[PDB]
PDB file of all heavy atoms in Angstrom:
ATOM      1  N   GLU D 245     -37.435  14.121  35.477  1.00 32.83           N
ATOM      2  CA  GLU D 245     -38.096  15.282  34.889  1.00 32.83           C
ATOM      3  C   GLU D 245     -37.265  15.883  33.770  1.00 32.83           C
ATOM      4  O   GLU D 245     -37.812  16.436  32.807  1.00 32.83           O
ATOM      5  CB  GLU D 245     -38.353  16.339  35.963  1.00 32.83           C
ATOM      6  CG  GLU D 245     -39.242  15.901  37.118  1.00 32.83           C
ATOM      7  CD  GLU D 245     -40.683  15.685  36.725  1.00 32.83           C
ATOM      8  OE1 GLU D 245     -41.162  16.372  35.798  1.00 32.83           O
ATOM      9  OE2 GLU D 245     -41.344  14.842  37.368  1.00 32.83           O
ATOM     10  N   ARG D 249     -38.853  16.213  30.061  1.00 41.29           N
ATOM     11  CA  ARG D 249     -39.087  17.530  29.480  1.00 41.29           C
ATOM     12  C   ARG D 249     -38.096  17.841  28.360  1.00 41.29           C
ATOM     13  O   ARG D 249     -38.499  18.239  27.263  1.00 41.29           O
ATOM     14  CB  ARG D 249     -39.040  18.580  30.584  1.00 41.29           C
ATOM     15  CG  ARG D 249     -39.404  19.972  30.150  1.00 41.29           C
ATOM     16  CD  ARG D 249     -39.491  20.894  31.353  1.00 41.29           C
ATOM     17  NE  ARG D 249     -40.616  20.558  32.226  1.00 41.29           N
ATOM     18  CZ  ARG D 249     -40.500  20.126  33.478  1.00 41.29           C
ATOM     19  NH1 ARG D 249     -39.305  19.969  34.026  1.00 41.29           N
ATOM     20  NH2 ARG D 249     -41.583  19.846  34.186  1.00 41.29           N
ATOM     21  N   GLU D1110     -52.991  17.066  33.076  1.00 80.97           N
ATOM     22  CA  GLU D1110     -52.520  17.802  34.245  1.00 80.97           C
ATOM     23  C   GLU D1110     -53.204  17.334  35.522  1.00 80.97           C
ATOM     24  O   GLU D1110     -52.552  17.191  36.560  1.00 80.97           O
ATOM     25  CB  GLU D1110     -52.729  19.301  34.054  1.00 80.97           C
ATOM     26  CG  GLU D1110     -51.757  19.935  33.093  1.00 80.97           C
ATOM     27  CD  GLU D1110     -52.003  21.415  32.918  1.00 80.97           C
ATOM     28  OE1 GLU D1110     -53.035  21.912  33.418  1.00 80.97           O
ATOM     29  OE2 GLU D1110     -51.159  22.083  32.289  1.00 80.97           O
ATOM     30  N   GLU D1111     -54.508  17.067  35.461  1.00 82.54           N
ATOM     31  CA  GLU D1111     -55.208  16.561  36.635  1.00 82.54           C
ATOM     32  C   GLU D1111     -54.753  15.147  36.974  1.00 82.54           C
ATOM     33  O   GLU D1111     -54.625  14.796  38.154  1.00 82.54           O
ATOM     34  CB  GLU D1111     -56.715  16.602  36.404  1.00 82.54           C
ATOM     35  CG  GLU D1111     -57.536  16.225  37.619  1.00 82.54           C
ATOM     36  CD  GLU D1111     -59.020  16.330  37.366  1.00 82.54           C
ATOM     37  OE1 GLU D1111     -59.405  16.650  36.223  1.00 82.54           O
ATOM     38  OE2 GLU D1111     -59.804  16.099  38.311  1.00 82.54           O
ATOM     39  N   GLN D1113     -51.654  13.843  36.344  1.00 79.62           N
ATOM     40  CA  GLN D1113     -50.334  13.926  36.959  1.00 79.62           C
ATOM     41  C   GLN D1113     -50.387  14.579  38.328  1.00 79.62           C
ATOM     42  O   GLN D1113     -49.592  14.231  39.205  1.00 79.62           O
ATOM     43  CB  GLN D1113     -49.362  14.688  36.064  1.00 79.62           C
ATOM     44  CG  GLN D1113     -48.937  13.945  34.826  1.00 79.62           C
ATOM     45  CD  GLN D1113     -47.915  14.724  34.027  1.00 79.62           C
ATOM     46  OE1 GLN D1113     -47.581  15.858  34.368  1.00 79.62           O
ATOM     47  NE2 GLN D1113     -47.405  14.117  32.961  1.00 79.62           N
ATOM     48  N   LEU D1114     -51.322  15.504  38.542  1.00 82.80           N
ATOM     49  CA  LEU D1114     -51.436  16.151  39.840  1.00 82.80           C
ATOM     50  C   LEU D1114     -51.943  15.178  40.888  1.00 82.80           C
ATOM     51  O   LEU D1114     -51.392  15.102  41.994  1.00 82.80           O
ATOM     52  CB  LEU D1114     -52.351  17.366  39.732  1.00 82.80           C
ATOM     53  CG  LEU D1114     -52.476  18.206  40.996  1.00 82.80           C
ATOM     54  CD1 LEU D1114     -51.122  18.758  41.384  1.00 82.80           C
ATOM     55  CD2 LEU D1114     -53.465  19.334  40.778  1.00 82.80           C
ATOM     56  N   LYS D1115     -52.977  14.401  40.547  1.00 80.91           N
ATOM     57  CA  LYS D1115     -53.455  13.365  41.454  1.00 80.91           C
ATOM     58  C   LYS D1115     -52.421  12.274  41.654  1.00 80.91           C
ATOM     59  O   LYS D1115     -52.304  11.741  42.759  1.00 80.91           O
ATOM     60  CB  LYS D1115     -54.752  12.751  40.932  1.00 80.91           C
ATOM     61  CG  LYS D1115     -55.957  13.655  41.030  1.00 80.91           C
ATOM     62  CD  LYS D1115     -57.152  12.993  40.375  1.00 80.91           C
ATOM     63  CE  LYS D1115     -57.598  11.779  41.169  1.00 80.91           C
ATOM     64  NZ  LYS D1115     -58.838  11.183  40.607  1.00 80.91           N
ATOM     65  N   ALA D1117     -49.046  12.633  41.532  1.00 75.86           N
ATOM     66  CA  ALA D1117     -48.015  13.168  42.406  1.00 75.86           C
ATOM     67  C   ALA D1117     -48.510  13.329  43.836  1.00 75.86           C
ATOM     68  O   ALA D1117     -47.778  13.010  44.779  1.00 75.86           O
ATOM     69  CB  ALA D1117     -47.513  14.507  41.867  1.00 75.86           C
ATOM     70  N   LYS D1118     -49.756  13.780  44.024  1.00 71.34           N
ATOM     71  CA  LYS D1118     -50.249  13.977  45.383  1.00 71.34           C
ATOM     72  C   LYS D1118     -50.514  12.647  46.076  1.00 71.34           C
ATOM     73  O   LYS D1118     -50.164  12.482  47.250  1.00 71.34           O
ATOM     74  CB  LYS D1118     -51.505  14.839  45.383  1.00 71.34           C
ATOM     75  CG  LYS D1118     -51.952  15.221  46.779  1.00 71.34           C
ATOM     76  CD  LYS D1118     -53.111  16.192  46.773  1.00 71.34           C
ATOM     77  CE  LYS D1118     -53.482  16.583  48.195  1.00 71.34           C
ATOM     78  NZ  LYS D1118     -54.609  17.555  48.251  1.00 71.34           N
ATOM     79  N   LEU D1121     -46.919  11.142  46.828  1.00 76.66           N
ATOM     80  CA  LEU D1121     -46.270  11.759  47.980  1.00 76.66           C
ATOM     81  C   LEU D1121     -47.030  11.499  49.273  1.00 76.66           C
ATOM     82  O   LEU D1121     -46.415  11.401  50.343  1.00 76.66           O
ATOM     83  CB  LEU D1121     -46.086  13.256  47.763  1.00 76.66           C
ATOM     84  CG  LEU D1121     -44.740  13.662  47.155  1.00 76.66           C
ATOM     85  CD1 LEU D1121     -44.601  13.294  45.685  1.00 76.66           C
ATOM     86  CD2 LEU D1121     -44.492  15.146  47.370  1.00 76.66           C
ATOM     87  N   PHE D1186     -43.234  17.705  53.569  1.00 84.48           N
ATOM     88  CA  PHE D1186     -44.266  17.193  52.676  1.00 84.48           C
ATOM     89  C   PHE D1186     -45.124  18.310  52.106  1.00 84.48           C
ATOM     90  O   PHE D1186     -45.384  18.347  50.899  1.00 84.48           O
ATOM     91  CB  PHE D1186     -45.136  16.188  53.431  1.00 84.48           C
ATOM     92  CG  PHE D1186     -46.359  15.744  52.676  1.00 84.48           C
ATOM     93  CD1 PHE D1186     -46.257  14.855  51.619  1.00 84.48           C
ATOM     94  CD2 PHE D1186     -47.618  16.203  53.041  1.00 84.48           C
ATOM     95  CE1 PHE D1186     -47.387  14.446  50.932  1.00 84.48           C
ATOM     96  CE2 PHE D1186     -48.748  15.797  52.361  1.00 84.48           C
ATOM     97  CZ  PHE D1186     -48.632  14.917  51.305  1.00 84.48           C
ATOM     98  N   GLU D1187     -45.555  19.241  52.962  1.00 83.20           N
ATOM     99  CA  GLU D1187     -46.441  20.313  52.506  1.00 83.20           C
ATOM    100  C   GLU D1187     -45.738  21.252  51.532  1.00 83.20           C
ATOM    101  O   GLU D1187     -46.265  21.562  50.451  1.00 83.20           O
ATOM    102  CB  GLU D1187     -46.982  21.091  53.704  1.00 83.20           C
ATOM    103  CG  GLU D1187     -47.968  20.302  54.537  1.00 83.20           C
ATOM    104  CD  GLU D1187     -49.264  20.017  53.798  1.00 83.20           C
ATOM    105  OE1 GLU D1187     -49.689  20.857  52.975  1.00 83.20           O
ATOM    106  OE2 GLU D1187     -49.860  18.945  54.041  1.00 83.20           O
ATOM    107  N   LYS D1188     -44.523  21.688  51.884  1.00 84.89           N
ATOM    108  CA  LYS D1188     -43.827  22.641  51.024  1.00 84.89           C
ATOM    109  C   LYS D1188     -43.368  21.994  49.716  1.00 84.89           C
ATOM    110  O   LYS D1188     -43.440  22.623  48.651  1.00 84.89           O
ATOM    111  CB  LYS D1188     -42.660  23.290  51.775  1.00 84.89           C
ATOM    112  CG  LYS D1188     -41.532  22.367  52.204  1.00 84.89           C
ATOM    113  CD  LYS D1188     -40.483  23.134  52.986  1.00 84.89           C
ATOM    114  CE  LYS D1188     -39.691  24.063  52.077  1.00 84.89           C
ATOM    115  NZ  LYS D1188     -38.581  24.736  52.804  1.00 84.89           N
ATOM    116  N   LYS D1189     -42.975  20.714  49.744  1.00 85.34           N
ATOM    117  CA  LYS D1189     -42.570  20.093  48.491  1.00 85.34           C
ATOM    118  C   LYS D1189     -43.764  19.654  47.655  1.00 85.34           C
ATOM    119  O   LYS D1189     -43.639  19.542  46.433  1.00 85.34           O
ATOM    120  CB  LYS D1189     -41.620  18.928  48.745  1.00 85.34           C
ATOM    121  CG  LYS D1189     -40.216  19.397  49.066  1.00 85.34           C
ATOM    122  CD  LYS D1189     -39.299  18.236  49.347  1.00 85.34           C
ATOM    123  CE  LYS D1189     -39.063  17.399  48.108  1.00 85.34           C
ATOM    124  NZ  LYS D1189     -38.115  16.286  48.388  1.00 85.34           N
ATOM    125  N   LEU D1190     -44.934  19.454  48.268  1.00 88.28           N
ATOM    126  CA  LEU D1190     -46.131  19.246  47.464  1.00 88.28           C
ATOM    127  C   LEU D1190     -46.513  20.520  46.733  1.00 88.28           C
ATOM    128  O   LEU D1190     -46.909  20.472  45.562  1.00 88.28           O
ATOM    129  CB  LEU D1190     -47.286  18.762  48.340  1.00 88.28           C
ATOM    130  CG  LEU D1190     -48.569  18.280  47.649  1.00 88.28           C
ATOM    131  CD1 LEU D1190     -49.137  17.137  48.454  1.00 88.28           C
ATOM    132  CD2 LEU D1190     -49.645  19.355  47.511  1.00 88.28           C
ATOM    133  N   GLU D1191     -46.410  21.666  47.411  1.00 89.71           N
ATOM    134  CA  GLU D1191     -46.685  22.931  46.734  1.00 89.71           C
ATOM    135  C   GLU D1191     -45.665  23.201  45.634  1.00 89.71           C
ATOM    136  O   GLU D1191     -46.012  23.702  44.556  1.00 89.71           O
ATOM    137  CB  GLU D1191     -46.715  24.072  47.748  1.00 89.71           C
ATOM    138  CG  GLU D1191     -46.987  25.436  47.135  1.00 89.71           C
ATOM    139  CD  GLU D1191     -48.362  25.549  46.497  1.00 89.71           C
ATOM    140  OE1 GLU D1191     -49.308  24.879  46.965  1.00 89.71           O
ATOM    141  OE2 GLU D1191     -48.493  26.307  45.515  1.00 89.71           O
ATOM    142  N   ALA D1192     -44.407  22.819  45.866  1.00 88.74           N
ATOM    143  CA  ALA D1192     -43.376  22.994  44.843  1.00 88.74           C
ATOM    144  C   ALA D1192     -43.613  22.074  43.645  1.00 88.74           C
ATOM    145  O   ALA D1192     -43.424  22.478  42.491  1.00 88.74           O
ATOM    146  CB  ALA D1192     -41.996  22.753  45.451  1.00 88.74           C
ATOM    147  N   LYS D1193     -44.048  20.840  43.900  1.00 86.42           N
ATOM    148  CA  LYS D1193     -44.337  19.918  42.807  1.00 86.42           C
ATOM    149  C   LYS D1193     -45.544  20.386  42.003  1.00 86.42           C
ATOM    150  O   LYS D1193     -45.564  20.268  40.772  1.00 86.42           O
ATOM    151  CB  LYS D1193     -44.569  18.515  43.365  1.00 86.42           C
ATOM    152  CG  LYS D1193     -44.699  17.432  42.318  1.00 86.42           C
ATOM    153  CD  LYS D1193     -43.364  17.201  41.639  1.00 86.42           C
ATOM    154  CE  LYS D1193     -43.452  16.110  40.589  1.00 86.42           C
ATOM    155  NZ  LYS D1193     -43.724  14.785  41.204  1.00 86.42           N
ATOM    156  N   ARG D1194     -46.537  20.966  42.681  1.00 88.07           N
ATOM    157  CA  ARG D1194     -47.707  21.479  41.979  1.00 88.07           C
ATOM    158  C   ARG D1194     -47.356  22.697  41.133  1.00 88.07           C
ATOM    159  O   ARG D1194     -47.841  22.840  40.004  1.00 88.07           O
ATOM    160  CB  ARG D1194     -48.818  21.811  42.972  1.00 88.07           C
ATOM    161  CG  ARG D1194     -50.075  22.306  42.299  1.00 88.07           C
ATOM    162  CD  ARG D1194     -51.231  22.449  43.252  1.00 88.07           C
ATOM    163  NE  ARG D1194     -52.406  22.952  42.549  1.00 88.07           N
ATOM    164  CZ  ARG D1194     -53.603  23.092  43.102  1.00 88.07           C
ATOM    165  NH1 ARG D1194     -53.792  22.755  44.367  1.00 88.07           N
ATOM    166  NH2 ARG D1194     -54.613  23.560  42.385  1.00 88.07           N
ATOM    167  N   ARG D1195     -46.485  23.574  41.642  1.00 92.39           N
ATOM    168  CA  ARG D1195     -46.119  24.730  40.826  1.00 92.39           C
ATOM    169  C   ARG D1195     -45.163  24.346  39.704  1.00 92.39           C
ATOM    170  O   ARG D1195     -45.064  25.072  38.710  1.00 92.39           O
ATOM    171  CB  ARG D1195     -45.525  25.853  41.679  1.00 92.39           C
ATOM    172  CG  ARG D1195     -44.134  25.607  42.220  1.00 92.39           C
ATOM    173  CD  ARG D1195     -43.654  26.780  43.058  1.00 92.39           C
ATOM    174  NE  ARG D1195     -44.413  26.938  44.293  1.00 92.39           N
ATOM    175  CZ  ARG D1195     -44.285  27.973  45.118  1.00 92.39           C
ATOM    176  NH1 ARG D1195     -43.424  28.943  44.836  1.00 92.39           N
ATOM    177  NH2 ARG D1195     -45.012  28.044  46.223  1.00 92.39           N
ATOM    178  N   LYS D1196     -44.464  23.214  39.826  1.00 93.53           N
ATOM    179  CA  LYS D1196     -43.701  22.732  38.678  1.00 93.53           C
ATOM    180  C   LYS D1196     -44.599  22.101  37.621  1.00 93.53           C
ATOM    181  O   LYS D1196     -44.327  22.240  36.424  1.00 93.53           O
ATOM    182  CB  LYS D1196     -42.626  21.735  39.108  1.00 93.53           C
ATOM    183  CG  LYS D1196     -41.449  22.367  39.824  1.00 93.53           C
ATOM    184  CD  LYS D1196     -40.310  21.379  39.982  1.00 93.53           C
ATOM    185  CE  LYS D1196     -40.615  20.345  41.040  1.00 93.53           C
ATOM    186  NZ  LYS D1196     -39.447  19.461  41.282  1.00 93.53           N
ATOM    187  N   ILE D1197     -45.661  21.408  38.027  1.00 93.73           N
ATOM    188  CA  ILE D1197     -46.511  20.746  37.040  1.00 93.73           C
ATOM    189  C   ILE D1197     -47.412  21.751  36.332  1.00 93.73           C
ATOM    190  O   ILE D1197     -47.527  21.742  35.101  1.00 93.73           O
ATOM    191  CB  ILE D1197     -47.324  19.619  37.697  1.00 93.73           C
ATOM    192  CG1 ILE D1197     -46.399  18.494  38.145  1.00 93.73           C
ATOM    193  CG2 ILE D1197     -48.365  19.072  36.744  1.00 93.73           C
ATOM    194  CD1 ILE D1197     -47.089  17.447  38.974  1.00 93.73           C
ATOM    195  N   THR D1198     -48.038  22.651  37.089  1.00 91.31           N
ATOM    196  CA  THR D1198     -49.084  23.504  36.535  1.00 91.31           C
ATOM    197  C   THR D1198     -48.523  24.601  35.627  1.00 91.31           C
ATOM    198  O   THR D1198     -49.209  25.036  34.693  1.00 91.31           O
ATOM    199  CB  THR D1198     -49.904  24.095  37.690  1.00 91.31           C
ATOM    200  OG1 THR D1198     -50.354  23.026  38.531  1.00 91.31           O
ATOM    201  CG2 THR D1198     -51.145  24.845  37.207  1.00 91.31           C
ATOM    202  N   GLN D1199     -47.272  25.014  35.833  1.00 93.88           N
ATOM    203  CA  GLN D1199     -46.727  26.136  35.076  1.00 93.88           C
ATOM    204  C   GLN D1199     -46.470  25.755  33.622  1.00 93.88           C
ATOM    205  O   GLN D1199     -46.511  24.586  33.235  1.00 93.88           O
ATOM    206  CB  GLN D1199     -45.414  26.634  35.678  1.00 93.88           C
ATOM    207  CG  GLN D1199     -44.227  25.719  35.431  1.00 93.88           C
ATOM    208  CD  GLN D1199     -42.932  26.314  35.941  1.00 93.88           C
ATOM    209  OE1 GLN D1199     -42.906  27.438  36.436  1.00 93.88           O
ATOM    210  NE2 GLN D1199     -41.843  25.567  35.809  1.00 93.88           N
ATOM    211  N   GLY D1200     -46.189  26.774  32.817  1.00 89.58           N
ATOM    212  CA  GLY D1200     -45.906  26.571  31.414  1.00 89.58           C
ATOM    213  C   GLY D1200     -44.553  25.929  31.185  1.00 89.58           C
ATOM    214  O   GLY D1200     -43.775  25.672  32.106  1.00 89.58           O
ATOM    215  N   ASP D1201     -44.266  25.670  29.914  1.00 92.40           N
ATOM    216  CA  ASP D1201     -43.052  24.972  29.518  1.00 92.40           C
ATOM    217  C   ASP D1201     -42.335  25.770  28.446  1.00 92.40           C
ATOM    218  O   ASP D1201     -42.975  26.300  27.534  1.00 92.40           O
ATOM    219  CB  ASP D1201     -43.375  23.566  29.018  1.00 92.40           C
ATOM    220  CG  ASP D1201     -43.817  22.648  30.136  1.00 92.40           C
ATOM    221  OD1 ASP D1201     -43.351  22.847  31.276  1.00 92.40           O
ATOM    222  OD2 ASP D1201     -44.634  21.738  29.886  1.00 92.40           O
TER     223      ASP D1201
END
Side-chain angles (χ1 to χ4, degrees):
Chain D
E245 300 291 329
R249 186 173 292 116
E1110 286 179 351
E1111 186 178 3
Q1113 288 183 356
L1114 185 61
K1115 288 175 68 175
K1118 187 174 182 179
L1121 267 72
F1186 171 75
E1187 290 293 327
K1188 64 183 289 185
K1189 283 179 67 178
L1190 189 145
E1191 180 64 30
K1193 188 69 180 294
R1194 182 172 179 175
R1195 72 180 67 188
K1196 287 191 286 185
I1197 293 172
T1198 307
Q1199 74 175 357
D1201 289 329

